[model samples]
Target: VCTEPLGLKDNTIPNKQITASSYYKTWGLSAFSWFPYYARLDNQGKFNAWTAQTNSASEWLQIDLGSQKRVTGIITQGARDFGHIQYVAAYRVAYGDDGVTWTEYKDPGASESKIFPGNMDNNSHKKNIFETPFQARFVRIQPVAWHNRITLRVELLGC
Candidate 1:
């Protein structure tokens, strides 16, 4: 299975949402105006989020911790628009130190599936925290979902 690592939830390690090929759109008339800003992924609330350029599995969002560190978990906040309608049903996480090399992050169980649930609520402040402790500088979220326009926000918990 997985290696048992000794560490607590490390919030001290700074993190920021990295870019993909593109984003969905710009600010709109309503509170959900800011569409493409990556900063929305941080520990924030309401309309602060990021959406991808195109609607496909290839649209990925990443978080760079700036240096190698022990990542304890990842909290994903789905775009809370259209009354919890725009959300990802399944997705995968990949990690890398050099940024060039990447590997899928999965459960300790060999037979475990890489796909994880995106949860029910859309814009809720509560997020789906995936506990995947690993040492890496970059974490990428690839959506292979039952829904969504590739819109999400994230928080990387690590030391």
Candidate 2:
């Protein structure tokens, strides 16, 4: 089951399942129409990915699996805004079952949160395999660093 996509890439995961700390919105556009729901891997629409309202490390993209599942890995991609290439350079992952309490992913012997390397360019996909898989209903990706803006497209891998 770990080999299968958890659904963001194909849209099997509903809009409600995807959320974020903050998402970029255009003043004239429908507010609800633009959100983290657009952060689907390889999305082709005008809003190709989800972007934070501001460029900062506090922004995060979250996914709720509805129920507990073994999460093994995550795939991240960047987005292009107008002619500017935007991509996250590094990030940290946190997961929890209730969404109230979260545990950041840490390497085997690391004392702090594990910073996963993100995309290099605005189109290439970066895959990060968890050294130790865990079960949880909610997963959050917090941006640590980026190239231009905090724009991202993502897919989760698990059972």
Candidate 3:
């Protein structure tokens, strides 16, 4: 019975704990390097979030808690790339223990993966609470829809 931030906002989760399918990186231009570690909530740098190489459903941002833990909710935020406002409009959550076998989050009676609503605008925090809490060591966020690009900053809630 816990409800608290899981440390993505404060760097307590560490740099190696965050992983992604791919990130936007360019040589010689430091401003274009948006790594997975920069996906911390309210982060400020070359870019304050992680931008996938492609804007597709195949891209995902994954987090490893190092050990199993209860995850109850997620808070997502959009990102700004120069002048373009990008964000995920909807996404699906998948949890796993070994990172190979994943279980897509679904509503209690739903048969398919649940598409959780995401941010509406850049910078505004949008949170989605799970209908039922789940336990896992690895969690992945797969974007289903977006405004401009698949750029995101996130935080998890649990003990």
Candidate 4:
């Protein structure tokens, strides 16, 4: 019998939070925010920061997995006590295999934006659990219509 070396499966690493996006700032030096931290929604840190940019629905934040993989779902945050935030009213979670062509993740059959349950309470962290077998190396959570700016803490899970 043959077996592979000990390793992790679907292990979402902190460093895997690719520092390759539109406005992925370093840390300081900007008043807006940075992706390296807030996008680190799973662990390592808390408090929903931002990606230091103001572009209209141009897909502000993104995750590059290096290669195409199954994306099960994502955990998104809303307004909290720590920092001033906005609950995601309506947004689109899109994906692309080649990182070029993109498609939005919607319910079974819906052309409109998916209405997310408002996240007012800090404990009420909303998540978009995908029913479809979404596959992509690049995932972008675009704000179609939000309560405030597209401020959210997100974590992706998959193989």
Candidate 5:
């Protein structure tokens, strides 16, 4: 059972921890040729329409999990990358129910049995479920290597 539907327009959006840099629109798609110079100042508010691309794929989505609940699973999608996700590696998911502590889901992204157990590989819509249980409110999804990442659109789905 969930207290509320997953939403980013509410208090759960990552306040201001992202550090996207050198943004440009290309061929009807935004592109990133460099990584961020520094992290953002955390203005303490909601962030919508936040788009970023990193050549090294060392980007992060730091969210404020307001309350603790069982995270049955999660879904990942590729944003406006010219309508296709090129590649991904070491796709990591981390969570922190408490404000000061955090723990990453203890499984690699390419692991089988440890994925969103009931997922289908339909290229039209990229979605992946994690094979982990999280008693957390805050979550962060990040790429661990240089794989050319794009999160043209990301919306959190949770309690």
Candidate 6:
């Protein structure tokens, strides 16, 4: 991919619509706080699990994958004042056409203003972009400060 900027609509990555609920599942948790914020089963009407966020980074959260995909961009959301985000400091995406030897996206990382909502300052959930193409099974975001050091909602978009 080129080093051009891939703009988005209201901070949404293409085909990626993340809510407070699904993001926590990417971490492999069975249950978490903010259960009401999670997605529900249309048939069972039950909820998935979630993680607790007392504004600490004691545990590392991760997302797994099912198939080979390419990530061409990143997007974030949420008002600037209410979350714990040091910044959108770092990101990692790995692709496995063979399910191994995943390569990293070498573009310069994104900034805070690029990842959050429009009305806020220095929020991690603001939208940002890079024209780097990443292919992998695991897409990861580091502990880049969740605005207030609490839980921040971020989504991943891929092709």
- List candidate 4 stretches off by more than 4 Å: 1-11, 14-28, 42-48, 79-83, 113-115, 121-123
Can you write out model 6's per-residue Cα lDDT over 1-159, one digit (the tens) per residue? 432222223232332322221233323554523332321111122222222244344322333434545556554433222233222233333334443344444455644322222213332344445455566555443333443333333444555
What C-alpha root-mean-square deviation, in Å, does candidate 2 show against the real structure? 1.6
- Residue by residue across 1-159, what tens digits does model 5's lDDT show? 432334443434443433343332344343432222111221122221233443555556555545676665554333223543433334566778664575757654543323222112212233454444567766665555322443322334445
lDDT over C-alpha atoms for residue 84 of model 4: 46
Q: Report the CA-based lDDT of candidate 3 relative to the real structure.
A: 0.89
lDDT of 4 by residue, 1-159 (tens): 112211112234444544424543334445544553455453223434444245356644566776767777666664342454554555667788776787877788777646545345333556666667577788777755555455555666677
Question: What is candidate 3's TM-score against the reference?
Answer: 0.94
Sort by lDDT, top down from the best: 3, 2, 1, 4, 5, 6
Winner on lDDT between 1 and 3 is: 3
The order of the candidates by TM-score, greatest first, is 3, 2, 1, 4, 5, 6
lDDT of 5: 0.42
Tens-digit per-residue lDDT, 80-117, candidate 2: 87778888899999999999899999988779999999
Stretches > 4 Å off in candidate 1:
1-17, 26-47, 81-84, 111-113, 125-132
| lDDT of model 4 at position 52 | 28
Total clashing pairs in model 2: 0
Model 5 regions lying over 4 Å from their true place? 1-5, 9-50, 81-90, 107-123, 145-148
**Which residue pairs show collisions in model 2?**
none
Query: How many clashes would you count in candidate 6?
Result: 30
Provide the lDDT at 68 for model 1: 81
TM-score against truth, every candidate: 0.70, 0.94, 0.94, 0.66, 0.51, 0.43
- Stretches off by above 4 angstroms in model 3 are 26-31
Q: What is each predicted model's overall lDDT from 0 to 1?
A: 0.59, 0.88, 0.89, 0.54, 0.42, 0.36
Q: Which ten residues in a row have the lowest lDDT in candidate 1?
A: 2-11
